[PDB]
Amino acid sequence: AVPARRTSKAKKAKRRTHYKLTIKGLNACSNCGEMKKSHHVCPACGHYDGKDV
Amino acid sequence: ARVKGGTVTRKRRKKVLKLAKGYYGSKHTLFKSAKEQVMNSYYYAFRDRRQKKRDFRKLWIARINAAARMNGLSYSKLMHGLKLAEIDINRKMLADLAVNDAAAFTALAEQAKDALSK
Amino acid sequence: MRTTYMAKAGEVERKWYVVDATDVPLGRLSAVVASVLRGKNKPTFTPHVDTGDFVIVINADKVKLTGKKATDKIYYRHSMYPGGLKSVTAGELRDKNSRRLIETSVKGMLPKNTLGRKQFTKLNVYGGAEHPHAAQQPEVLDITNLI
Amino acid sequence: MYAIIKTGGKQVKVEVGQAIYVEKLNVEAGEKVVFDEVILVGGESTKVGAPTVAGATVEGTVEKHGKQKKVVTFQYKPKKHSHRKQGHRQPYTKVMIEAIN
Amino acid sequence: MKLHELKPAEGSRQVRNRVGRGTSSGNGKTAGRGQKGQKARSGGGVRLG
Amino acid sequence: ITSAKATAKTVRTSPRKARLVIDLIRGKSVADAISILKFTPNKSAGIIEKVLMSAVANAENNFDLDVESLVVSEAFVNEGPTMKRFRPRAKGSASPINKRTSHITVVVTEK
RNA sequence: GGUGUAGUGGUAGGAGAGCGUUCUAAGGGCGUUGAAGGUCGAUCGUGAGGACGGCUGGAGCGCUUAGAAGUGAGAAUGCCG
RNA sequence: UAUCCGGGAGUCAGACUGCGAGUGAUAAGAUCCGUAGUCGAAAGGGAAACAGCCCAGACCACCAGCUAAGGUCCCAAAAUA
RNA sequence: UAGUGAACCAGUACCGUGAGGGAAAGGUGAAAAGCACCCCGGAAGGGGAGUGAAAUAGAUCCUGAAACCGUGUGCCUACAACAAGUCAAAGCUCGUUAAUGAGUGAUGGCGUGCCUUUUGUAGAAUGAACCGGCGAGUUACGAUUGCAUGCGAGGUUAAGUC
Ligand SMILES: [K+]
Ligand SMILES: [K+]
Ligand SMILES: [K+]
Ligand SMILES: [K+]
Ligand SMILES: [K+]
Ligand SMILES: [K+]
Ligand SMILES: [K+]
Ligand SMILES: [K+]
Ligand SMILES: [K+]
Ligand SMILES: [K+]
Ligand SMILES: [Mg+2]
Ligand SMILES: [Mg+2]
Ligand SMILES: [Mg+2]
Ligand SMILES: [Mg+2]
Ligand SMILES: [Mg+2]
Ligand SMILES: [Mg+2]
Ligand SMILES: [Mg+2]
Ligand SMILES: [Mg+2]
Ligand SMILES: [Mg+2]
Ligand SMILES: [Mg+2]
Ligand SMILES: [Mg+2]
Ligand SMILES: [Mg+2]
Ligand SMILES: [Mg+2]
Ligand SMILES: [Mg+2]
Ligand SMILES: [Mg+2]
Ligand SMILES: [Mg+2]
Ligand SMILES: [Mg+2]
Ligand SMILES: [Mg+2]
Ligand SMILES: [Mg+2]
Ligand SMILES: [Mg+2]
Ligand SMILES: [Mg+2]
Ligand SMILES: [Mg+2]
Ligand SMILES: [Mg+2]
Ligand SMILES: [Mg+2]
Ligand SMILES: [Mg+2]
Ligand SMILES: [Mg+2]
Ligand SMILES: [Mg+2]
Ligand SMILES: [Zn+2]
């Protein structure tokens, strides 16, 4: 099967509506204040739950 | 004496595209689609410059009909009476009176009713 | 000169009429009501704007069906599933849900577009003689001579 | 007060001090023009012409002569490799209404 | 005469007619040859007589 | 004078995939944008991070602006030159391959 | 030039008259105080089409008359990019 | 308007409708003629949509008027005559 | 994209066992004065600072079209059946080659692309993915007719010589 008609710019953009990235789970690290991912070791200071690791 | 393409081609196609400004997507972006649409636009425009007169006479007739009914008369009876009474006010003006000058319209309707009675 | 009047949305005042359907043939009631809803009865009628008035139809259960329409006029509807054709007689609709009877008849006569659907919403049908729209101060609209 | 006059095979509503556009009038700019076919006169009272109000006329001054925006008549038949293009600019006369009788 | 005001005798010179240069000219597309057939071909036509 | 821009041209990456990350950071404080790019695993995140940091370095060094107040006023990706390649396919025929590039631009203003 | 009368759908196709492109000759001009070209504009003519401004551009180009043509593209499962 | 003389063609696949015939089965949107129209090469109104049927031939502009076929309760202009 | 296939390291690259086939590809600036130095970056690439009349002339360099991609937004859009327009049109926004202006457009009417080929095509027949460029009645020698000019019961030279 092949496209019968080429896809227009408007239709193509409509389809890509949901083709987007997202960033979630970021909040300030307790130890150093840098933004980190919740439930992850802070990449900057290497602290999690207030202890170096 | 070689005559290369030059710029006449671009000039002509840009004229068509400017005519097609406002069309949907390719119909305003691409010359071939644009030209095809502009041609249909011409056809529709020529046809509609005739349909336009029909539509407005139709609109005036409907409004005149409503006003005549409010005055106790059908549009057909009103126009027959006006012709008998020699009134040549056309439908455009009659519709204008109906919407705005209801008093003047009532005077015209009374003359039409008088003519019909006679 | 391009001076023809064109009504604006919101400038025309829509009234409220009460139409008693008692023993009025269904179609004729629907026709007069449809003209009112479209606003064809007013000089300010503008085809591309809504200018008609609201209608309250009472005693829908007493609407008149001449001839054998009561049992032989059939309203069909297809569920879009194969063999999904449903039918109900006009008489049965009048007896059980007369509101739908009047509404279907009037829908057929209004335009099949956005403006037409909006104009339909201004219709209110009530089998029986009493309605809840007294707050709108509707006035009776005799149709004995209109039909 | 206002009047309805018969001009250019068409009827126009005129009020003192209102400019009206009509089919070209054979009159120089800035000159006076009298419309004698007053088919109605309205205002506080109403005058109905049968077909014209007797002895009622409208007076105006020809402000301008001009040409209306161009209209293009392009006639073509699909698949018949045949088209014809035409332009038009209808002349008009703009008249300021001075007096209504 | 003056080289900048030359004027041929009236009717002495005509403009060559060029075919296949658009429909409105009246010789577009088919170039006056008609539709299909032997006479519509490049080098078409039968010998004289 | 109130804004500084940085640009990376002819960077090997998909313009569309880059625009995903760019849309994430557009119109955001510089600190927030830096954090988002750091924790975004997509390839273009690192490229855009260097461009943003370069732009901030411009705003500070070249024009002595206020880093804390800096925000990402404008950011976008433009198509760069496309490198043409071919990949053999079945039955002795090749198919073209477009190795895309991107022009990544970031503009950061005082407020 | 005016009036009057009549007429003015159109494929194949015949006739007529024009628009625009490059170049030649002559004449008369325009150009680092910005040509051609590009872009934008609500401009003009009955049509092909013609100007005029803004921006871009950086060195050639109009106009009048006549002349000669590699002289006009939207289609050829056209060729090239 | 016809002739005649000359330059230049295109056309040699037609279609349907009404009427008169053949072939067919007194079938076919069949086929083959005669005859008139229309389409072909004709837009517009009506016939729901609908080349060939009915009305009627678009040089243009108008938010003027009168009619043809066909229509006037609503969609939808006009008689709940 | 012309002109030699070849304006440039072309009969080269490349293709083929071989004969053979056979490309693409010109332009900074007057002058390299071809961006010292500083900053981000591993670099690339940028931002300053400079050269320059001009750097949106920075070497992928004169001009820089269209397709195509993207950013910003004045208007509109989540009850709507759309050959995408045209006619009518409220609202909103804006102010021109100053014109009975411009953009957008709720809503209403009408409305089945272009071409080719056909009796007949919206056609579920053919062609076109889009954009740009190139791409088709020409010339020579004769024949014949019209128009024009010169001469006119005459008209006219061909080769050839200067
Ligand atoms: K011919
Ligand atoms: K210009
Ligand atoms: K092509
Ligand atoms: K002949
Ligand atoms: K026949
Ligand atoms: K430059
Ligand atoms: K946009
Ligand atoms: K529409
Ligand atoms: K086929
Ligand atoms: K001759
Ligand atoms: Mg060309
Ligand atoms: Mg008419
Ligand atoms: Mg010649
Ligand atoms: Mg022809
Ligand atoms: Mg063609
Ligand atoms: Mg052919
Ligand atoms: Mg044939
Ligand atoms: Mg032939
Ligand atoms: Mg293999
Ligand atoms: Mg005609
Ligand atoms: Mg030139
Ligand atoms: Mg050519
Ligand atoms: Mg047959
Ligand atoms: Mg034919
Ligand atoms: Mg027709
Ligand atoms: Mg046809
Ligand atoms: Mg009449
Ligand atoms: Mg009606
Ligand atoms: Mg009756
Ligand atoms: Mg070559
Ligand atoms: Mg520049
Ligand atoms: Mg350049
Ligand atoms: Mg709904
Ligand atoms: Mg909605
Ligand atoms: Mg066939
Ligand atoms: Mg195809
Ligand atoms: Mg092409
Ligand atoms: Zn931390």
From TrEMBL, chain B:
One of its GO terms (molecular function) is structural constituent of ribosome. InterPro entries: Ribosomal_bL20, RIBOSOMAL_L20_CS, Ribosomal_protein_bL20_C. The keyword Magnesium does not apply. Pfam families: Ribosomal_L20. It comes from the Bacteria. One of its GO terms (biological process) is translation. Keywords: Ribonucleoprotein, Ribosomal protein, RNA-binding, rRNA-binding. Signal peptide: none annotated. One of its GO terms (cellular component) is ribonucleoprotein complex. Binds directly to 23S ribosomal RNA and is necessary for the in vitro assembly process of the 50S ribosomal subunit. It is not involved in the protein synthesizing functions of that subunit. Belongs to the bacterial ribosomal protein bL20 family. This is Large ribosomal subunit protein bL20. The gene is rplT.
Automatic annotation (TrEMBL), chain C:
InterPro entries: Ribosomal_uL13 (IPR005822), Ribosomal_uL13_bac-type (IPR005823), Ribosomal_uL13_CS (IPR023563), Ribosomal_uL13_sf (IPR036899). It holds the Pfam family Ribosomal_L13. GO terms for molecular function: mRNA binding; structural constituent of ribosome. It comes from the Bacteria. GO terms for cellular component: cytosolic large ribosomal subunit. The keyword Electron transport does not apply. Belongs to the universal ribosomal protein uL13 family. This is Large ribosomal subunit protein uL13. It comes from Enterococcus faecalis (Streptococcus faecalis).
From TrEMBL, chain D:
Keywords: Ribonucleoprotein, Ribosomal protein, RNA-binding, rRNA-binding. GO terms for molecular function: rRNA binding; structural constituent of ribosome. One of its GO terms (cellular component) is ribonucleoprotein complex. One of its GO terms (biological process) is translation. This protein binds to 23S rRNA in the presence of protein L20. Belongs to the bacterial ribosomal protein bL21 family. Part of the 50S ribosomal subunit. Contacts protein L20. This is Large ribosomal subunit protein bL21. It comes from Enterococcus faecalis.
TrEMBL record, chain F:
The keyword Calcium does not apply. GO terms for biological process: translation. Belongs to the universal ribosomal protein uL22 family. It holds the Pfam family Ribosomal_L22. GO terms for cellular component: cytosolic large ribosomal subunit. This protein binds specifically to 23S rRNA; its binding is stimulated by other ribosomal proteins, e.g. L4, L17, and L20. It is important during the early stages of 50S assembly. It makes multiple contacts with different domains of the 23S rRNA in the assembled 50S subunit and ribosome. Part of the 50S ribosomal subunit. Transmembrane segments: none annotated. It comes from Enterococcus faecalis. This is Large ribosomal subunit protein uL22. Coiled coil: none annotated. The lineage of its organism: Bacteria, Bacillati, Bacillota, Bacilli, Lactobacillales. GO terms for molecular function: rRNA binding; structural constituent of ribosome. Keywords: Ribonucleoprotein, Ribosomal protein, RNA-binding, rRNA-binding. PROSITE patterns: RIBOSOMAL_L22. It comes from the Bacteria.
